[PDB]
């Protein structure tokens, strides 16, 4: 007999998949450059979106891993002896204050958990629990968000996961140092309900199920024509 | 004590992570019905298979219907296709196919159910035939008779179930490998025709469903080929 361990929900949805690649400067530039932001959602990576949308209701934790790689930037007045660099990684749960620029007061709020990671170590990790009001995240929602039967159709429901922000703690007088962030996302303790048929049409919106009418399968030569795509050889001369 | 390989990030590691939000009491789980424990629970359910995709029906419902008509057709073939899920254009789009494409090694047997969606007073016979991997397909009804066959009487019985077995030298066969004349063919032939009483339709339609038996296992998870697009949406 053959085992079915490889097809279970855990082993099917617990692969760490990169969801965001961002870059941000250190000293010089407009305020929007100096920090990197991302709202946690699973509707923008097409592969992960398809695998999650295979079901309707889901319930899981979140493990997030950050691979931050820094580098120097060409220009004028280059530093020769910066000791190290440190990064602040901030999680903003729904209902929390949000920074609008670097060096804002919101970076010191005591309600937002933060990680101070100094480069050279192992990449930083965190594990966010099931943060929601309802009893399960619902991928597909049919209805309107406001009881007056008008609003955004089937969106911005009571499911949210928060935002995540990264900033350079080290104020740098001379030179500009760029950094690149890669965010790896993995669900843990997944529970899934109400299976669905996998999608067919190409994905077109990060919030809608809008689509183009596509065919149901691939064309074939004839109704009763078997493949026979083997060239001339020792067999079938 | 510690090797330099101790300080690394391996993307397929399963270690506990520090909790960002301790002392947070999560919402208790309720009993939403219909929980699934294993994706093999999904491939064991029947799906309608588009056997009639002759390049003009893929953009219509007509792809699902196999046409059967009564007349001077003595031994003309109703339909025929190669039994290779995961890659064959007949099967690769159904539930079974789109579960298999997520995996790289597959094992077990398959089940086909033909349903005669015709009138209640139409009589005839049909000769379903199965050819093993090590054989060429039949070309005359007599050839398909002398192999493995089942005779379906559409007057007595309205549905037929045919179970295609697992024959292979090795345990797991690759999903994406085209085995020319090594997968097996299924063909159906007229035996008597179609007989109808006066005032009744002279044509019918034979739907087909394909599903998995209890015997599958799958191995080596990978990425599907169907999602050609890769960019971050919007």
């Amino acid at each position, epitope marked *: 007999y053959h085992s079915r361990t490889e097809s279970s929900i855990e082993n099917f949805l617990c692969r760490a998949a990169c969801v965001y690649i961002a870059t941000y400067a250190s000293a010089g530039g407009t305020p929007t450059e100096r920090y990197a932001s991302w709202r946690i959602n699973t509707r923008q990576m097409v592969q992960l979106r398809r695998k999650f949308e295979l079901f309707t209701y889901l319930r899981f934790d979140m493990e997030i891993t950050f691979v931050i790689t820094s580098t120097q930037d060409p220009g004028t007045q280059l530093a020769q002896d910066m000791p190290v660099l440190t990064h602040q990684i901030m999680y903003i749960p729904p209902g929390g204050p949000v920074p609008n620029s670097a060096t804002d007061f919101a970076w010191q709020s005591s309600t937002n958990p933060s990680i101070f990671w100094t480069e050279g170590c192992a990449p930083a990790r965190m594990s966010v629990p099931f943060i929601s009001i309802g009893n399960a995240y619902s991928n597909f929602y049919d209805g309107w968000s406001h009881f007056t039967q008008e609003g955004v159709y089937g969106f911005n429901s009571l499911n949210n996961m928060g935002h995540i922000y990264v900033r350079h703690v080290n104020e740098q007088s001379l030179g500009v140092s760029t950094s690149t962030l890669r965010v790896y996302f993995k669900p843990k303790h997944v529970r899934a309900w109400v299976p669905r048929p996998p999608r067919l049409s190409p994905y077109v919106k990060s919030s809608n199920v809008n689509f183009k009418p596509t065919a149901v399968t691939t064309e074939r030569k004839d109704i009763n024509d078997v493949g026979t795509l083997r060239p001339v050889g020792y067999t079938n*001369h | 004590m510690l090797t330099p390989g101790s300080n690394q990030f391996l993307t397929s590691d399963d270690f506990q992570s520090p909790s960002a939000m301790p002392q947070f009491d999560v919402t208790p789980e309720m009993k939403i019905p219909g929980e699934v424990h294993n994706l093999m629970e999904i491939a064991e359910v029947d799906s309608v298979v588009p056997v009639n995709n002759t390049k003009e029906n893929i953009n219509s419902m007509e792809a699902y219907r196999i046409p059967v008509t009564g007349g001077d057709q003595l031994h003309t073939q109703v339909f025929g296709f190669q039994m290779q899920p995961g890659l064959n254009s007949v099967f690769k789009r159904t539930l079974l196919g789109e579960i298999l494409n997520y995996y790289a090694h597959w094992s077990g047997s398959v089940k086909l159910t033909f349903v005669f969606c015709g009138s209640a007073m139409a009589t005839g016979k049909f000769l379903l035939a199965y050819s093993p991997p090590g054989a060429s397909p039949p070309q005359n009804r007599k050839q398909a008779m002398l192999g493995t066959h089942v005779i379906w009487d559409v007057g007595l019985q309205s549905s037929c179930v045919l179970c295609i077995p697992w024959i292979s030298q090795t345990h797991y066969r690759l999903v994406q*490998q085209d085995e020319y004349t090594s997968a097996g063919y299924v063909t159906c032939w007229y035996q008597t025709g179609l007989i109808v009483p006066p005032g009744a339709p002279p044509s019918c339609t034979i739907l087909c469903f394909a599903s998995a038996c209890n015997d599958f296992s799958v191995r080596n998870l990978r990425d599907t080929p169907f999602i050609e697009q890769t960019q971050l949406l919007q």
Partner: antibody
Framework: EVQLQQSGPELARPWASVKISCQAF???????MQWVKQSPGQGLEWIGP????????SYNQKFKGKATLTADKSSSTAYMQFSSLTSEDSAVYYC???????????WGQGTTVTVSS | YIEASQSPSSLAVSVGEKVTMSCKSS????????????LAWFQQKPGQSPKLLIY???TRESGVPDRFTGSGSGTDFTLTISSVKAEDLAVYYC?????????FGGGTKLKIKR
């Protein structure tokens, strides 16, 4: 670089069967013999292959039911039979031979099969 | 029926100029097991026996000069002559040996420009 011969160019007649032999200077081991026809225009068209050492017979659908193949490996002479010949069959009938499974290296000399109505 | 399509026009160029010709074998000619292309180019001296020049779509033939170079994969295939010659008059064909039937190309004569 081995040369290749045949029966020869002969002036035939309508409904007069033309036997074009093809001489052999090789073995009969899993290699093949075939013909093509050199018409005034559009180059060459295949007529039918025969594989000695495999007992395989095949015909082009443009000649199906109209041409037949007979071969004699021992005598080194193999026939290409035909009947009901028309006046539009006049072409240089080249005999090609292949020591391979899928190749077309060698070529023949040619025969002129023009007739006179 | 597998179809091949030659270039609509012949060379129509002077002697000694680099020339590029192409054959479009519609049905795919790449074999999974061997990664081989079953397409060979042919030259036909008018009245003499034609012979192929580049076979396997990657190999120059024995006894064939270094000027003829044929490449390509998939449905399309292309051939280049580094310098055309006047005494090499022929009608260039492309023949596929993937599957029956054996179909020739469309032809390309070495016409006169002088």
């Amino acid at each position: 670089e081995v040369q290749l011969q045949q029966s020869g160019p002969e002036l035939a007649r309508p409904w007069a069967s033309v036997k074009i032999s093809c001489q052999a200077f090789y073995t009969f081991s899993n290699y093949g013999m075939q013909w093509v026809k050199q018409s005034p225009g559009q180059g060459l068209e295949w007529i039918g292959p025969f594989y000695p050492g495999n007992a395989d017979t095949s015909y082009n659908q443009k000649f199906k039911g109209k041409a037949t193949l007979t071969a004699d490996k021992s005598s080194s002479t193999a026939y290409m039979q035909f009947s009901s010949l028309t006046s539009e069959d006049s072409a240089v009938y080249y005999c090609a031979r292949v020591v391979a499974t899928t190749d077309f290296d060698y070529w023949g000399q040619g025969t002129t099969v023009t007739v006179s109505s | 029926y597998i179809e091949a399509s030659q270039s609509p026009s012949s060379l129509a160029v002077s002697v000694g100029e680099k020339v590029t010709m192409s054959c479009k074998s519609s049905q795919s000619l790449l074999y999974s097991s061997n990664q081989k292309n079953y397409l060979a180019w042919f030259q036909q001296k008018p009245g003499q026996s034609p012979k192929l020049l580049i076979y396997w779509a990657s190999t120059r033939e024995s006894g064939v000069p270094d000027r003829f170079t044929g490449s390509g994969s998939g449905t399309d295939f292309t051939l280049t002559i580094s310098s055309v010659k006047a005494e090499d008059l022929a009608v260039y064909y492309c023949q596929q040996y993937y599957s029956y039937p054996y179909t020739f190309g469309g032809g390309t004569k070495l016409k006169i420009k002088r």
